[PDB]
Design a protein around this motif. Structure first.
Motif, mmCIF file in Angstrom:
data_model
loop_
_atom_site.group_PDB
_atom_site.id
_atom_site.type_symbol
_atom_site.label_atom_id
_atom_site.label_comp_id
_atom_site.label_asym_id
_atom_site.label_seq_id
_atom_site.Cartn_x
_atom_site.Cartn_y
_atom_site.Cartn_z
ATOM 1 N N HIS A 177 8.841 2.614 -2.614
ATOM 2 C CA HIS A 177 7.383 2.718 -2.514
ATOM 3 C C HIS A 177 6.900 4.103 -2.944
ATOM 4 N N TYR A 178 7.718 5.134 -2.735
ATOM 5 C CA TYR A 178 7.426 6.454 -3.296
ATOM 6 C C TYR A 178 7.411 6.409 -4.822
ATOM 7 N N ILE A 179 8.381 5.719 -5.422
ATOM 8 C CA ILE A 179 8.393 5.574 -6.875
ATOM 9 C C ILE A 179 7.165 4.787 -7.338
ATOM 10 N N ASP B 208 0.894 -1.161 0.000
ATOM 11 C CA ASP B 208 0.000 0.000 0.000
ATOM 12 C C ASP B 208 0.928 1.205 0.000
ATOM 13 N N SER B 209 1.358 1.622 -1.191
ATOM 14 C CA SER B 209 2.366 2.667 -1.298
ATOM 15 C C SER B 209 1.842 4.033 -0.901
ATOM 16 N N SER B 210 0.533 4.184 -0.681
ATOM 17 C CA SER B 210 0.031 5.466 -0.194
ATOM 18 C C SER B 210 0.533 5.775 1.209
ATOM 19 N N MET B 211 1.024 4.772 1.932
ATOM 20 C CA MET B 211 1.557 4.978 3.265
ATOM 21 C C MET B 211 3.002 5.459 3.266
ATOM 22 N N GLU B 212 3.640 5.600 2.095
ATOM 23 C CA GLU B 212 5.046 6.002 2.077
ATOM 24 C C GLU B 212 5.275 7.311 2.818
ATOM 25 N N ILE B 213 4.297 8.220 2.782
ATOM 26 C CA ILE B 213 4.497 9.562 3.311
ATOM 27 C C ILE B 213 4.735 9.560 4.819
ATOM 28 N N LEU B 214 4.264 8.529 5.536
ATOM 29 C CA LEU B 214 4.414 8.489 6.988
ATOM 30 C C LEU B 214 5.872 8.667 7.423
ATOM 31 N N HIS B 215 6.817 8.066 6.697
ATOM 32 C CA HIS B 215 8.218 8.085 7.108
ATOM 33 C C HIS B 215 9.031 9.180 6.433
ATOM 34 N N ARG B 216 8.367 10.158 5.807
ATOM 35 C CA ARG B 216 9.044 11.390 5.426
ATOM 36 C C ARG B 216 8.320 12.632 5.941
ATOM 37 N N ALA B 217 7.269 12.471 6.753
ATOM 38 C CA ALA B 217 6.494 13.618 7.223
ATOM 39 C C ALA B 217 7.378 14.614 7.975
#
Lengths: 338, 338
Positions: free
Chosen positions: B89-91, A182-191
């Motif tokens: 996962h961002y890509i 679920d790549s939409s969760m990628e943002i959690l670890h760059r917030a």
């Protein structure tokens, strides 16, 4: 058929959570809620040396020799040595030392399952060698990392682990292995972070708790919390691999899960899967903590070598990595441990 | 049969070597010996953003859609973003956004060939999807990196590159892909360095020239130089992949090699393989430099899109990564470029 032919590990001394609180490393009320009893901590063993140690143990209990190894796959989550130096070739040089390929794989805490999947496909598509070597190692004793506080979900732990995967036999049979993202969760670890230049080149490290706080501040209203996304994908991938292995929960003796604190372990894994407490490895995991990518195979080696599973028992391995991605495997124990 | 169905890239503006000398970034009379004319330099584009740009271009020139992509494999050599964040996962989230696996592969400058090998075995062993997506990106414009002096062998360069591998058709057929290691060479890239804690956590970076000088100081007498080890292995793997492809040098139209300075390029690749000058990509490579893992596929896309190779021509890709490992591929062009 593919089998786990050998398994091995490097487990540093267990640092009591009591002592971490006594020394000001760990908040008492985080210890209270997590249920952590200790974490594996290596003061100075390089992560590639932990991988070499685990790999030597796995190879020489595998019944295979160096000439059987067609590839070495090393995974990890944290820095391994000098920038631009190949940790995996250092591991190869001190374990197999044949001119076979040496490749690094990264998929967070799923690194060993991802590596196992790469080795499986190679053993199926390449007839040249009967086996493959999969390793991992990580050491979080590095400048500025506070292993007890970096994340509120877990304590970071150090270890090495390795397995030999083989087409010709072993102590357990690999029945199924799959993953889904679920790549939409990628943002959690760059917030709250700048992508460029990457933080480590600017003195920014594993500030997971800080990133999670930015997520809470910014989370859009009316959106199910991220833990739901994680737990839903965990349930989906487990249902898929059980179906692929043609085994039911009935037949699963042990669930080898990550070494999270109890609240996160329950929210992400035990509740979505409705795991009976006797099938968990909680009382082992809460003495180890969360290694980079070794958790699942440390747990497998533990339940096998202590005799908690024997021939005919099935074991589920389940994890979820940053990104996010949920991954699972089912193995059938075929031999008792010495 | 497996094919390259699409290829794409992100190439930043070319920074003139003249201007590097004029600004004190590059020694004049290293420019003189290397023959470098420019290097691709991105001031501020994140490496995963360059990979996303290349992947979008590769996908939509591939004739496959997002539903055909069974896995995304991303390779690199240098830091990608925050520690513990998943660049791949961002890509995935910005290119395919299907719940398929997303994995990072690292093998120095061979990262895309290693990824191609993983995708090939997966397409052979897994019937589920017809295609796979392989990407790379790196940006060396980070604190303390001196891209023109870090190594005396090459100038560091920034880029993204991507390919779609397909079982159902494409512009080139993959005939052979193989690699072989000499892991005794690992010591070259840690000479004079402490393994633990890893240098980057202590502010030590890409000091390749310094490590090489330490090798010269410490190298024992009677011992062949490391360049011989590298060049012998390059010749071995090339002979092996030509044999696996059942093609002779006679049939090779172009050799897509790394963007090294001329002396290193000749010593490690052109002389061991006795490449006719018309078969090299030197006058393209000397305007780009040495990207992390994109050199081989930037060269392939260049000779293909400029019409220097056409249907029926064979192309050799050859590289050698730290560790060390030599890798090669042979492709037969099946379609001309638009």
């Amino acid at each position: 058929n593919l089998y786990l032919a050998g398994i091995g590990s490097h487990l540093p001394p267990l640092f009591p959570a009591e002592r971490a609180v006594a020394e000001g490393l760990y908040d008492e009320e985080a210890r209270q809620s997590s249920g952590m009893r200790s974490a594996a901590v290596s003061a100075s063993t390089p992560a590639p040396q932990m991988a070499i140690d685990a790999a030597r143990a796995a190879l020489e209990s595998s019944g295979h020799d160096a000439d059987d190894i067609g590839i070495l796959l090393h995974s990890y989550t944290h820095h391994q040595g000098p920038d631009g130096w190949s940790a995996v070739h250092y591991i190869l040089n001190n374990t197999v030392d044949r001119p076979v390929p040496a490749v690094e794989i990264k998929q967070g805490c799923l690194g060993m399952l991802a590596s196992l999947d790469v080795a499986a496909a190679r053993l199926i598509a390449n007839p040249t060698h009967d086996a493959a070597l999969i390793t991992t190692g990580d050491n979080y004793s590095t400048p500025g990392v506070e292993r007890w506080r970096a994340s509120g979900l877990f304590v970071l732990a150090d270890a090495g682990s390795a397995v030999v995967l083989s087409r010709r036999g072993g102590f357990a049979e690999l029945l199924a292995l799959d993953s889904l993202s679920d790549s939409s969760m990628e943002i959690l670890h760059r917030a709250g972070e700048e992508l460029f230049p990457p933080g480590v080149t600017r003195g920014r490290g594993l500030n997971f708790a800080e990133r999670a706080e930015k997520v809470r501040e910014q989370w859009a209203a009316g959106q199910a919390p991220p833990i739901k996304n994680f737990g839903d994908r965990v349930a989906e991938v487990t249902e898929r691999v059980l179906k692929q292995a043609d085994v039911s929960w009935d037949q699963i003796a042990k669930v080898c899960h990550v070494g999270f604190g109890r609240p996160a372990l329950e929210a992400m894994f035990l509740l979505p899967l409705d795991v009976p407490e006797e099938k968990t490895v909680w009382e082992y995991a809460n003495t180890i903590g969360h290694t980079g990518a070794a958790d699942l195979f440390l747990g497998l080696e533990h339940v096998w070598r202590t005799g908690q599973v024997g021939p005919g028992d099935h074991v589920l391995l389940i994890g979820a990595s940053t990104g996010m991605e949920a991954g699972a495997a089912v193995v059938r124990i075929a031999e008792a441990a010495p």
